[PDB]
Swiss-Prot record, chain A:
GO cellular component: mitochondrial inner membrane; mitochondrial small ribosomal subunit; mitochondrion
Protein family membership: Belongs to the universal ribosomal protein uS5 family.
Subcellular location: Mitochondrion
InterPro entries noted in UniProt: Ribosomal_Su5_D2-typ_SF (IPR020568), Ribosomal_uS5 (IPR000851), Ribosomal_uS5_C (IPR005324), Ribosomal_uS5_N (IPR013810), Ribosomal_uS5_N_CS (IPR018192), Ribsml_uS5_D2-typ_fold_subgr (IPR014721)
Purpose of the protein: Component of the mitochondrial ribosome (mitoribosome), a dedicated translation machinery responsible for the synthesis of mitochondrial genome-encoded proteins, including at least some of the essential transmembrane subunits of the mitochondrial respiratory chain. The mitoribosomes are attached to the mitochondrial inner membrane and translation products are cotranslationally integrated into the membrane.
Keywords for this protein: Mitochondrion, Ribonucleoprotein, Ribosomal protein, Transit peptide
One GO process term, biological-process aspect: translation
Residue ranges constituting the S5 DRBM domain according to the UniProt record: 131-195
Protein name: Small ribosomal subunit protein uS5m
Additional remarks: Present with 6680 molecules/cell in log phase SD medium.
UniProtKB/Swiss-Prot annotation, chain B:
Keywords noted in UniProt: Mitochondrion, Ribonucleoprotein, Ribosomal protein, Transit peptide
CDD domains: RPS2
Protein name in the entry: Small ribosomal subunit protein uS2m
InterPro entries with a match to the protein in the record: Ribosomal_uS2, Ribosomal_uS2_bac/mit/plastid, Ribosomal_uS2_CS, Ribosomal_uS2_flav_dom_sf
GO term, biological process aspect, one: mitochondrial translation
Curated annotation (Swiss-Prot), chain C:
UniProt key word Transit peptide: yes
GO CC annotations, alphabetized: mitochondrial inner membrane; mitochondrial small ribosomal subunit; mitochondrion
MF (Gene Ontology): RNA binding; structural constituent of ribosome
Function statement: Component of the mitochondrial ribosome (mitoribosome), a dedicated translation machinery responsible for the synthesis of mitochondrial genome-encoded proteins, including at least some of the essential transmembrane subunits of the mitochondrial respiratory chain. The mitoribosomes are attached to the mitochondrial inner membrane and translation products are cotranslationally integrated into the membrane.
Places the protein is found: Mitochondrion
First-listed, main subcellular location of the protein, grouped into a coarse class: mitochondrion
GO BP annotations, alphabetical order: mitochondrial translation
Protein's name in the database: Small ribosomal subunit protein uS9m
Subunit-structure text: Component of the mitochondrial small ribosomal subunit (mt-SSU). Mature yeast 74S mitochondrial ribosomes consist of a small (37S) and a large (54S) subunit. The 37S small subunit contains a 15S ribosomal RNA (15S mt-rRNA) and 34 different proteins. The 54S large subunit contains a 21S rRNA (21S mt-rRNA) and 46 different proteins.
Keyword field contains Ribosomal protein: yes
Family according to the record: Belongs to the universal ribosomal protein uS9 family.
Species per Swiss-Prot/TrEMBL record: Saccharomyces cerevisiae (strain ATCC 204508 / S288c) (Baker's yeast)
UniProtKB/Swiss-Prot annotation, chain D:
Leader sequence residues: none
Name of the protein in question: Small ribosomal subunit protein mS23
Function text: Component of the mitochondrial ribosome (mitoribosome), a dedicated translation machinery responsible for the synthesis of mitochondrial genome-encoded proteins, including at least some of the essential transmembrane subunits of the mitochondrial respiratory chain. The mitoribosomes are attached to the mitochondrial inner membrane and translation products are cotranslationally integrated into the membrane.
Gene: RSM25
Family of this protein: Belongs to the mitochondrion-specific ribosomal protein mS23 family.
Domain of life: Eukaryota
Assembly with partners or alone: Component of the mitochondrial small ribosomal subunit (mt-SSU). Mature yeast 74S mitochondrial ribosomes consist of a small (37S) and a large (54S) subunit. The 37S small subunit contains a 15S ribosomal RNA (15S mt-rRNA) and 34 different proteins. The 54S large subunit contains a 21S rRNA (21S mt-rRNA) and 46 different proteins.
Record's miscellaneous remark: Present with 1920 molecules/cell in log phase SD medium.
Subcellular location: Mitochondrion
């Protein structure tokens, strides 16, 4: 289409009007333009080509194959910065990717909390604020293969809220011990269980429990007695919220099997007074508690 | 009385075929035969006032609905039937429609059928849990347990006796367990929970699909992927979730990528063949998902929250028990949609 | 009023929820229209079955999860619905099947019917080895000219002459056409067989019903063999 | 096979998750199961009469 100078003079710069006038006197109005399917001269988008893009066009003053300035008339005298910054926002961050501005600030507890919430539905706040994690076993194991000995890091950890909820988790990693502990912490939260506690301080009576080769003899204790037990059992009691306990381990004292045996004993070897009362149809009275009641 | 109306159309339809047939006849004739003779006539003819009327009325009528028109935009049953001529015999398609007419009216004259079992009605017309009797359960074969040689003695309390080398399940207990299980399905449905129906024995798909449809639930008939519940992010994260209102209508709200990766755990799992789905049962236990299952004499009752003692090998027995549970879910769904209306 | 997040598809917990949902939709149609008779032209082997490729169905049928047997199951149901008698089909079936038709509507074909030229001549080109031949076939009495020379002059070997005549011998039209053959490149064998190939392609215009017989005789197949640089 | 404990006590294990705060939201099945307790005795029962004869 041929347009009058008035219309074209309200959209295009004066410097380009003469070229438009000459083209409208050389190309007849009845020209039937054909599309080339061999050579693509024009870009894949529409452009009047009246403005120089700061990125998609050659930089004015920069030397290049098609620079029209004389070699003594270039205007780039500083070379410490990139001449043509990326267009638009200034980045090419893929959709769904985040710029790693800060590195090394993640909290392993928050990383465990986010993953478990997405995989199991547990509350992230409880994991990151209410739970305490304590490593119990940290060693290196090895497998003999045709290529050679392959070492692995093994971590056994216990987590708990100090208010009845405790869990045991194990983790393995061929790379580093930190990865093994992360997996163990992840596993421990998934294995969280509630353990009965008498007066939220001790166990109900005494426990004689056999876990594989470990013989566990645990006795309930008076208030203010403290924890007088194997060091492995001590850590578990701290996480679980047991304050008073006495005990002795016979036969095997393998740390791993003491920890698992203890967790099993606290759940499978205890019976609350309420459960005993209901099962037998009898009333069970704590004499010490009644003595100080109204 | 009004047949003429249709006759008027057919007349035009016949005329249309005639016009088209001879339009194609003139498409073969060479132009040299028609064109020069036609033009010569006009050279020997003089237009009249009336002739000119159509000289421009047709030019516009053809410059309006043929050239300057939009080529595109931005009898209801069997509408593609080609009726045969009134003298010609019925076509194959017409005979099919003629037979369908007979099937609706005449084909069922003479007697009605009562007290006869139709297999499809177990799926589409399941009874309500309160109307189930021992007779109905027995008619479906629910009492037929496994061979006494395959007995899992942990089922001893469900057994009524042994007969013909198999253990007979006590249907009095089956009925009580079934009613309890049905109430659970109804409760979960009325609460808006996700009910998954799992059955992987051949032929169960039809029952499973309808059960899910009438409870607005879900089903799996092919294979339970080990880890579907415990490893859900690696198996089911890619599939699409949606938000729905209290009427179970899609809200259409786009979901944040955070909400579309979260595990979507079933609120209740129904297992038709638990002996072949140990994986699913153990995952349900690990995931604290209550489960219902049909427990045959060789099946472990303690692996499920609500066992239903019954034959799990017959499709009739399974579809009978599934149908009852599915209708119980439907009633819960209908009671939830009703409380929203009022 | 209260809102909750639920799986979109009833088959969410299956191995391939997307494929199973699509199969269920087709199965419902095959159940609702179980009575409708199938095409009797299926015996006539109607040449219409433009279904999407396995890779194209993987975009909508679970991607990597999609298994070949699952694609085979989709085709067995798409064809069964497609083969319902056209007169007795309905919109519902066609609507469901439309999404599975390979998209080739925006584009057109590149073949224009071949016809005799202004002088009644059928022109075809043939190639064999390094040789090429352009023949002009017209209705005649069996006169042949090769590069303006008599057949016995240009081709000394009778087996080369017999090769040129074979396509005309298949349609039993040796004395019904005049051939003006022009050939260049290669040797006598390449040129004689290139002319043979070009005559066969030029004879199809005179009677397109004989193409099947020409194909069966093997004269319409371009011989691909050429001198191979030893590797 | 051992008499399983974890299938019939889903309500009690879930209740510990909710009381501690490990699980924020009550599951939809929770109320239903509480009102309809599972049978958890799994005992062998004697019989003193043949029902047939
Ligand atoms: Mg069985």
């Amino acid at each position: 289409q041929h347009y009058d100078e008035s219309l074209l003079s309200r959209y295009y710069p004066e410097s380009l009007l003469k070229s438009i006038k000459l083209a409208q006197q050389t190309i007849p109005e009845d020209t039937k333009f054909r599309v080339s399917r061999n050579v693509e001269f024009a870009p894949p988008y529409l452009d009047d080509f009246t403005k120089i893009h700061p990125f998609w066009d050659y930089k004015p003053g920069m030397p290049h194959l098609h620079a029209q300035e004389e070699n003594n008339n270039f205007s780039i005298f500083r070379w410490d910065q990139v001449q043509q910054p990326l267009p638009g926002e200034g980045n090419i961050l893929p959709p769904g990717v985040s710029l790693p501005n800060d590195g090394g600030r993640k909290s392993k507890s928050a990383d465990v909390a986010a993953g478990l919430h997405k995989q199991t539905g547990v509350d992230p706040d409880y994991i990151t604020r209410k739970l305490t994690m304590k490593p119990l076993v940290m060693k290196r194991v090895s497998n003999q293969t045709g290529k050679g000995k392959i070492a692995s890091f093994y971590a056994l950890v216990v987590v708990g809220d100090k208010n009845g909820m405790v869990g045991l988790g194990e983790g393995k990693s061929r790379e580093e011990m930190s990865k093994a502990i992360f997996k163990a912490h992840w596993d421990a939260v998934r294995n969280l269980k509630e353990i009965p506690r008498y007066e939220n301080r001790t166990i109900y009576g005494d426990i004689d429990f056999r876990y594989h080769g470990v013989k566990l003899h645990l006795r309930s204790a008076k208030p203010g007695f403290g924890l007088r037990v194997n060091h492995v059992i001590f850590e578990i009691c701290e996480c679980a919220g047991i304050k008073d306990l006495s005990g002795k381990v016979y036969k095997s004292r393998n740390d791993m099997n003491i920890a698992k045996g203890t967790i099993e004993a606290f759940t499978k070897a205890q019976k609350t007074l309420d459960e005993v009362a209901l099962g037998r149809g009898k009333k069970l009275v704590d004499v010490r508690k009644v003595y100080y009641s109204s | 009385p009004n047949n003429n109306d249709e006759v008027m159309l057919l007349q035009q339809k016949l005329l249309y075929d005639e016009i088209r047939s001879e339009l194609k006849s003139l498409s073969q004739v060479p132009e040299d035969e028609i064109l020069p003779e036609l033009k010569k006539s006009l050279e020997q003819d003089k237009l009249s006032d009336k002739e000119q009327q159509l000289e421009a009325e047709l030019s516009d009528f053809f410059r309006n609905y043929a050239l300057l028109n939009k080529l595109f935009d931005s009898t209801k049953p069997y509408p593609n039937l080609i009726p045969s001529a009134n003298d010609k015999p019925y076509s194959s398609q017409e005979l099919f429609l003629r037979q369908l007419n007979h099937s609706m009216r005449t084909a069922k004259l003479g007697a009605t059928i009562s007290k006869v079992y139709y297999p499809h009605k177990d799926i589409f017309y399941p009874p309500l849990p309160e109307n189930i009797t021992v007779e109905s359960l027995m008619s479906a074969g629910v009492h037929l347990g496994q061979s006494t040689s395959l007995w899992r003695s942990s089922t001893q309390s469900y057994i009524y006796g042994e007969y013909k080398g198999i253990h007979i399940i006590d249907l009095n207990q089956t009925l009580s367990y079934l009613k309890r299980a049905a109430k659970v399905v109804e409760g979960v449905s009325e609460s808006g929970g996700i009910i998954l129906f799992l059955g992987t024995r051949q032929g169960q798909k039809r029952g499973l699909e309808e059960a899910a449809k009438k409870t607005h639930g879900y089903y799996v008939s092919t294979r339970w992927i080990p880890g579907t519940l415990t490893n859900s992010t690696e198996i089911s994260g890619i599939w699409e979730k949606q938000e729905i209102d209290s009427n179970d209508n899609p809200t259409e709200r786009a979901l944040s990528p955070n909400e579309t990766s979260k595990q979507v755990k079933p609120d209740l799992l129904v297992v038709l063949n638990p002996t072949e789905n140990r994986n699913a049962l153990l995952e349900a236990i690990k995931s604290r998902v209550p489960t219902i299952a049909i427990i045959d004499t060789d099946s472990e009752p303690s692996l499920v929250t609500y066992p239903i003692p019954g034959n799990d090998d017959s499709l009739r027995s399974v579809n009978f028990l599934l149908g009852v549970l599915a209708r119980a879910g439907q009633r819960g769904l209908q009671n939830r949609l009703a409380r929203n209306n009022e | 009023l209260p809102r909750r997040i639920v799986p979109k598809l009833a088959t969410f917990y299956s191995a391939n929820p997307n494929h199973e949902d699509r199969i269920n939709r087709l199965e419902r149609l095959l159940r609702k229209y179980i009575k409708l008779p199938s095409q009797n032209n299926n015996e006539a082997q109607q040449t219409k079955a433009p279904w999407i490729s396995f890779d194209e169905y993987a975009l909508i049928g679970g991607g990597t999860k999609l298994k070949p047997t699952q694609y085979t199951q989709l085709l067995y149901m798409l064809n069964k619905l497609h083969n319902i008698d056209p007169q007795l089909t309905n919109d519902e079936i066609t609507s469901e099947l439309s999404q599975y038709y390979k998209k080739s509507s925006m584009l057109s074909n590149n073949i224009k019917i071949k016809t005799l030229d202004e002088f009644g001549r059928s022109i075809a080109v043939g190639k064999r080895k390094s040789s090429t031949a352009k023949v002009f076939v017209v209705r005649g009495t069996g006169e042949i000219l090769v590069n303006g020379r008599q057949l016995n002059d240009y081709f000394l070997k009778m087996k080369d002459r017999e090769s040129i005549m074979y396509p005309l011998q298949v349609i039993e039209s040796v004395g019904k056409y005049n051939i003006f053959a022009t050939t260049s490149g290669g040797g006598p064998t390449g040129q004689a067989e290139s002319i043979m190939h070009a005559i066969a392609k030029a004879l199809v215009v005179f009677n397109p019903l004989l193409k099947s017989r020409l194909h069966k005789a093997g004269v319409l197949t371009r011989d691909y063999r050429h001198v191979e640089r030893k590797k | 096979m051992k008499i399983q404990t974890n299938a019939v006590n889903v309500l009690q294990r879930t209740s510990a998750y909710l009381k501690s705060g490990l699980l924020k939201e009550t599951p939809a099945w929770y109320n239903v199961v509480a009102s309809i307790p599972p049978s958890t005795k799994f005992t062998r029962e004697p019989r003193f009469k043949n029902p047939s004869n």
